């Protein structure tokens, strides 16, 4: 889905 | 056989980390997107003065204790073409734990005391946005001994028990509380952990401990 990014905390 | 320069990046668009691969492709530098051991240098997005957010990159690269940089280092070997000293660009901190806390350069040096050295303990489920075996290997990296079910806590005397969790990942059950009876062992959160793992120091558990019911 062309996305996305990456979790962050 | 004897050294290596593998990397990975994180909190990157994709749009950036083109312009990584080209570097890398440039100077005869190995790239992965998935990270190991064999990995060296982790390249993470910061503020100008090397502060990044907190990806789980960013923490493992830490607790292995390698060389954690800016990507202003390769904008800046970009800008000059050339492979500047990585060094300089060290990460200082992070947004959460200090915007100089000089943890990933402590790891760097503290590796005959892993923080973790001595410490049994189970990831207790569940969990999100990193797994289980993750944070698994994450503690192990900083001298954790690891535990698969409650149970199974080795019990005395010199070895210390210890019980994660990530309580809001609990769906519809409360049930973290009760873990108190399962086991005498601390019930502490994630934060501590990261935290710890953060500064690379370990920490104390009060303000992460977590209420039990007997």
């Known amino acids: 889905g062309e996305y996305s990014r990456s979790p962050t905390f | ?28 530098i190995t790239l992965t997107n998935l990270i190991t051991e064999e990995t060296t240098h982790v390249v993470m997005k910061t503020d100008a003065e090397f ?3 907190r990806t789980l990159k960013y923490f493992l690269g830490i607790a292995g204790g390698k060389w954690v940089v800016s990507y202003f280092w390769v904008t800046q070997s970009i800008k000059e073409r050339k ?10 901190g992070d947004v959460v734990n ?42 192990q990296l900083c ?46 959160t994630r934060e501590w952990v990261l935290d710890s793992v953060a500064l690379y120091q370990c920490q104390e558990l009060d303000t992460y401990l977590i209420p039990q019911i007997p």
């Open chain 2, 143 to 188: 001298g954790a001994s690891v535990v698969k079910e409650l149970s199974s806590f080795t019990l005395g005397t010199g070895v210390h028990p210890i019980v994660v969790v990530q309580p809001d990942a609990w769906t519809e059950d409360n049930g973290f509380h009760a873990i108190g009876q399962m086991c005498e062992a601390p019930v502490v």
């Open chain 2, 51 to 53: 502060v990044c957010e």
């Open chain 2, 83 to 92: 492979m500047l000293n990585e060094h300089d660009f060290e990460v200082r």
């Open chain 2, 1 to 28: 056989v004897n050294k290596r320069m593998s990397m990975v990046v994180s909190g990157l668009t994709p749009e950036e980390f083109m312009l990584v691969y080209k570097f890398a492709r440039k100077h005869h």
């Open chain 2, 98 to 139: 200090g915007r100089n806390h000089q943890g990933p350069k402590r790891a760097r040096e503290s590796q005959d005391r892993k923080i973790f050295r001595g410490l049994e303990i189970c990831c207790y489920g569940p969990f999100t946005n990193m797994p289980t075996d993750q944070l698994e290997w994450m503690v």
